[PDB]
Amino acid sequence: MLNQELELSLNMAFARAREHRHEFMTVEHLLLALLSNPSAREALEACSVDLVALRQELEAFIEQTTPVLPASEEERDTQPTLSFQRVLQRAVFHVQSSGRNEVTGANVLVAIFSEQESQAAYLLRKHEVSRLDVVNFISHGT
Amino acid sequence: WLDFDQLDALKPPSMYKVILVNDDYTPMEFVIDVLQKFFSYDVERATQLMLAVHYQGKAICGVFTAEVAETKVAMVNKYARENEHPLLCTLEKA
Numbered sequence: 001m002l003n004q005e006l007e008l009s010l011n012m013a014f015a016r017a018r019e020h021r022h023e024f025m026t027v028e029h030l031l032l033a034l035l036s037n038p039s040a041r042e043a044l045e046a047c048s049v050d051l052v053a054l055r056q057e058l059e060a061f062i063e064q065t066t067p068v069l070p071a072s073e074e075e076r077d078t079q080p081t082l083s084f085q086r087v088l089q090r091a092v093f094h095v096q097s098s099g100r101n102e103v104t105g106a107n108v109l110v111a112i113f114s115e116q117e118s119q120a121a122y123l124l125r126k127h128e129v130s131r132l133d134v135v136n137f138i139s140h141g142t
Numbered sequence: 143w144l145d146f147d148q149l150d151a152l153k154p155p156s157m158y159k160v161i162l163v164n165d166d167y168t169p170m171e172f173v174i175d176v177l178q179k180f181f182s183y184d185v186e187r188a189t190q191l192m193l194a195v196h197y198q199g200k201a202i203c204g205v206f207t208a209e210v211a212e213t214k215v216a217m218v219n220k221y222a223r224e225n226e227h228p229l230l231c232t233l234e235k236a
């Protein structure tokens with residue numbers, strides 16, 4: 001059960017990727033969307049993350065590495081990467097394994113760390129954020 | 143459309159080469175189809191790459207991030223499977 005704010009983040013991110021004719025919806029598009037998702041934003045702020053810099057690093061990477069669909073192709077559209085699909089499934093699995101159903105942007109943030117070859121996970125660790133930092137925030141606040 | 147709930151030093155992730163491997167079953171026409179459909183090549187360049195796969199045994203289709211490369215490889219292999227060709231697509235660190 002993805003909560004309302006998470007679904008809104010996911011759907012708007014997918015719509016923007018489609019408007020930009022991006023061939024793929026990546027974990028980086030995902031993390032970028034999460035910067036304005038209240039649940040994930042709060043976790044990042046508790047980890048003293050420079051959200052302005054992370055936003056810029058994500059946007060630049062997305063523009064430089066995401067292939068753009070030609071105007072000629074009208075049969076295939078923006079699709080999620082395998083890595084993106086795994087992150088959402090992992091977020092749902094993590095929450096259900098604790099006996100709950102509500103999946104928030106913060107839970108998705110936690111799931112991103114397991115995609116070790118993703119630029120999003122690399123950038124989070126570059127900003128000195130670990131998976132445990134986010135889990136501790138979800139459990140204990142501060 | 144998508145259904146979201148039913149689909150020391152740090153080094154950045156490496157870029158990956160996406161490769162097409164030769165076999166004796168896959169028609170040249172299908173290899174070209176794959177190059178145009180999944181790699182956006184025009185007929186001419188796709189034909190050259192097809193010939194490289196044919197003579198050299200394998201050819202690099204493109205270089206992408208680890209994340210994009212993994213997806214492209216899965217898409218190509220699924221398309222080959224649906225069309226009943228043993229066309230093998232792989233990836234390798236750039």
Ligand SMILES: [Y+2]
Nearest residue numbers: 145146147148
């Ligand atoms: Y659904």
